[PDB]
Swiss-Prot record:
Protein name (Swiss-Prot/TrEMBL): Bromodomain-containing protein 4
Further facts: JQ1, a thieno-triazolo-1,4-diazepine derivative, and I-BET, a benzodiazepine derivative, have been tested on tumors with success. Treatment with GSK1210151A (I-BET151, a I-BET derivative) has strong effets on mixed lineage leukemia and promotes myeloid differentiation and leukemia stem-cell depletion.
Coiled coil feature spans: none
Entry's family note: Belongs to the BET family.
Domain comment in the entry: The NET domain mediates interaction with a number of chromatin proteins involved in transcription regulation (NSD3, JMJD6, CHD4, GLTSCR1 and ATAD5). The C-terminal (CTD) region mediates interaction and recruitment of CDK9 and CCNT1 subunits of the P-TEFb complex. It is also required for maintenance of higher-order chromatin structure.
Organism: Homo sapiens (Human)
Gene that this sequence comes from: BRD4
Length: 126
């Protein structure tokens, strides 16, 4: 069972805009979560071949990771801030869906989600 390709991260046909909200998502939210001690498993797609998890992509049909989110922001892939926020939410919930409650990786994602919510609290107005 091969890994799927990573989510798309750049599309020259998508329109581009700079907004206060998207700038904040890259410069504050993503940068803060990226440097966190628990960020490392989330910095690239789950490599289920390397990890011998043949049911990962049978269970998780909407993968997402922070490496993808970073690339999407840098490539002006998102038009609405909510698209980015949804991707963060998908990342965290994928981790809760697949892994056992109480596992280290779950507590890691929970800490990262709490930080994310503290950072999103101060998102600029639309
Ligand atoms: C560059 N490679 C890595 O950063 C890397 C190396 C070894 C393992 C991992 C890793 C990546 C993703 C995950 C886990 C481990 N997982 C772990 O259980 C785990 C335990 C402790 C840290 O990660 C399995 C699970 C599928 N998972 C997530 C994000 O849900 C990532």
């Amino acid at each position: 069972n091969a890994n799927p390709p990573p989510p798309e991260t750049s599309n020259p046909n998508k329109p581009k805009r700079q907004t206060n909200q998207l700038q904040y998502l890259l410069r504050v939210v993503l940068k803060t979560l990226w440097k966190h001690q628990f960020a490392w498993p989330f910095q690239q797609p789950v490599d289920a071949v390397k990890l011998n998890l043949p049911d990962y992509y049978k269970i998780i049909k909407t993968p997402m990771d922070m490496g993808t989110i970073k690339k999407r922001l840098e490539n002006n892939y998102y038009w609405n801030a909510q698209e980015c926020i949804q991707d963060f939410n998908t990342m965290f919930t994928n981790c809760y869906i697949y892994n056992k409650p109480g596992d280290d990786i779950v507590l890691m994602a929970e800490a990262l989600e709490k930080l994310f919510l503290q950072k999103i609290n101060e998102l600029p107005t639309e």
